[PDB]
Amino acid sequence: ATLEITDIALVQPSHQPLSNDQTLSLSHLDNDNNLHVSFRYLRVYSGESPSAVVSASLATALVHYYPLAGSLRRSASDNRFELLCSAGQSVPLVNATVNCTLESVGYLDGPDPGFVERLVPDPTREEGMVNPCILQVTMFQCGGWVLGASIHHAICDGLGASLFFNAMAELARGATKISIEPVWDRERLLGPREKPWVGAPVRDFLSLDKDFDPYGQAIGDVKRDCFFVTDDSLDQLKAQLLEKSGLNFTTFEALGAYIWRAKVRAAKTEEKENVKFVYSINIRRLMNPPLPKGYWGNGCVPMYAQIKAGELIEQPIWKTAELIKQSKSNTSDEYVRSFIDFQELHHKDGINAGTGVTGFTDWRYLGHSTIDFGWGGPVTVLPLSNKLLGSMEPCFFLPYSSGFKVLVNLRESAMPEFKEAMDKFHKGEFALS
Ligand SMILES: CC(C)(COP(=O)(O)OP(=O)(O)OC[C@H]1O[C@@H](n2cnc3c(N)ncnc32)[C@H](O)[C@@H]1OP(=O)(O)O)[C@@H](O)C(=O)NCCC(=O)NCCS
Numbered sequence: 479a480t481l482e483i484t485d486i487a488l489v490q491p492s493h494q495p496l497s498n499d500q501t502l503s504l505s506h507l508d509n510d511n512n513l514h515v516s517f518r519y520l521r522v523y524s525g526e527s528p529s530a531v532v533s534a535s536l537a538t539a540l541v542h543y544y545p546l547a548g549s550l551r552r553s554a555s556d557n558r559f560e561l562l563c564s565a566g567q568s569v570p571l572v573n574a575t576v577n578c579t580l581e582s583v584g585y586l587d588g589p590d591p592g593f594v595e596r597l598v599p600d601p602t603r604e605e606g607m608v609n610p611c612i613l614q615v616t617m618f619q620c621g622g623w624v625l626g627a628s629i630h631h632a633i634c635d636g637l638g639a640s641l642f643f644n645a646m647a648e649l650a651r652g653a654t655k656i657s658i659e660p661v662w663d664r665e666r667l668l669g670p671r672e673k674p675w676v677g678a679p680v681r682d683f684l685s686l687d688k689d690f691d692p693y694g695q696a697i698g699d700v701k702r703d704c705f706f707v708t709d710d711s712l713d714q715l716k717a718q719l720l721e722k723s724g725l726n727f728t729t730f731e732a733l734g735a736y737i738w739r740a741k742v743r744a745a746k747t748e749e750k751e752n753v754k755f756v757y758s759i760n761i762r763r764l765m766n767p768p769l770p771k772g773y774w775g776n777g778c779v780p781m782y783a784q785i786k787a788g789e790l791i792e793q794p795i796w797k798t799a800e801l802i803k804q805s806k807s808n809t810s811d812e813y814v815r816s817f818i819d820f821q822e823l824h825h826k827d828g829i830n831a832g833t834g835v836t837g838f839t840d841w842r843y844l845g846h847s848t849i850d851f852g853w854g855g856p857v858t859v860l861p862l863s864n865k866l867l868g869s870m871e872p873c874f875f876l877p878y879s880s881g882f883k884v885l886v887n888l889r890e891s892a893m894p895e896f897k898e899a900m901d902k903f904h905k906g907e908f909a910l911s
């Protein structure tokens with residue numbers, strides 16, 4: 479089962495939005511060192527070819543979204559990213575071909591056929607700044623196909639990228655203009671205060687060490703695996719957590735606690751180490767004033783819960799679920815401004831969440847089914863990046879179309895015991911207490 483790169487196309491805006499070079503600056507959220515990665519993910523789809531249709535809509539989208547065709551540069555000044563856009567810039571589109579069928583490979587929902595990494599560019603740090611947006615279209619023998627995207631995380635979050643992709647789709651679906659015009663305004667809207675201030679809720683999470691690389695820790699090879707989780711399993715868990723605590727818990731709080739406990743037990747973390755649950759909340763709608771609907775920059779911030787590893791592995795699940803629930807209350811306009819001001823004060827002083835960070839991202843929404851180029855909405859979405867939110871072992875909740883998959887990245891050494899913890903879970907043996 480083999481994949482071949484047939485050609486690479488350089489796709490320019492359909493008309494050139496720029497006369498003159500324009501150097502754009504990024505928000506203080508965009509320049510967090512934790513987002514210095516090329517975020518990689520793929521969408522699987524069941525005549526003009528998808529290559530033509532995708533590339534033509536990319537062209538027209540790039541009129542408004544031309545910064546994706548830019549280059550990221552460190553600025554001599556302060557070593558923050560700026561984005562160099564000139565006329566003639568392009569997005570690369572890799573055109574590929576695999577000699578098999580989507581159904582013969584179970585639409586990529588199952589185990590990796592062994593080319594799944596080859597389905598989306600994997601740029602180096604240097605390459606991924608020259609080209610902060612690379613797309614790939616890979617045809618299967620059934621006329622089924624995959625859209626891969628490598629987007630540098632400094633330019634947008636999942637929601638921002640989704641804005642960009644929904645625009646391409648809607649143009650592919652016949653539209654001649656896009657429904658939501660993207661807004662830059664980045665250093666105006668998410669810039670620091672003149673006299674920076676940082677509250678305890680941000681100071682209690684973060685730490686300075688210029689030598690510490692959160693994505694360079696020596697944990698071994700990190701494996702990817704998905705576990706199917708049933709609505710019934712989740713409702714029995716929720717009902718027992720309620721029996722024992724008197725609280726009702728979201729799936730994210732309940733399953734999140736179980737998964738975090740299992741991960742940490744299984745990595746054999748030492749009782750006294752501080753470990754973290756870190757997730758990404760939307761703040762577009764919570765700022766004062768709220769951010770414009772077309773903001774496609776980073777509009778997310780990390781929230782956290784923290785606890786000694788021994789307490790997590792030995793206290794009841796419902797105490798851990800409650801702690802994750804409490805963390806959602808730190809969420810305020812001020813928390814975000816506290817966060818931005820810490821980046822202002824300490825950007826070059828190695829801001830970090832320390833060791834033992836597990837990252838959690840809910841992808842169950844984000845607007846994937848609306849991304850339809852003429853072959854229906856995606857039948858499977860699969861994010862390949864394992865470097866996120868300060869974690870080398872991030873976990874995603876993937877969407878529906880009875881239940882949904884959880885994707886976990888975990889050090890090879892811990893994966894067996896974890897797989898066993900998910901088998902137990904699938905049988906309702908939750909060992910809550
Ligand atoms: C922080 C967060 C993950 C916590 O979610 P939560 O604990 O599930 O709590 P919420 O109040 O958001 O959701 C409450 C309930 O409504 C449901 N819900 C939320 N949005 C929904 C939607 N669009 N449609 C249907 N149900 C929805 C949830 O599934 C949950 O019920 P559940 O127990 O069945 O899962 C979530 O609120 C959030 O902010 N997500 C944004 C993440 C994001 O988009 N990141 C991308 C960055 S790269």
Ligand SMILES: [Ca+2]
Pocket residue numbers: 681682683684685
């Ligand atoms: Ca601190």
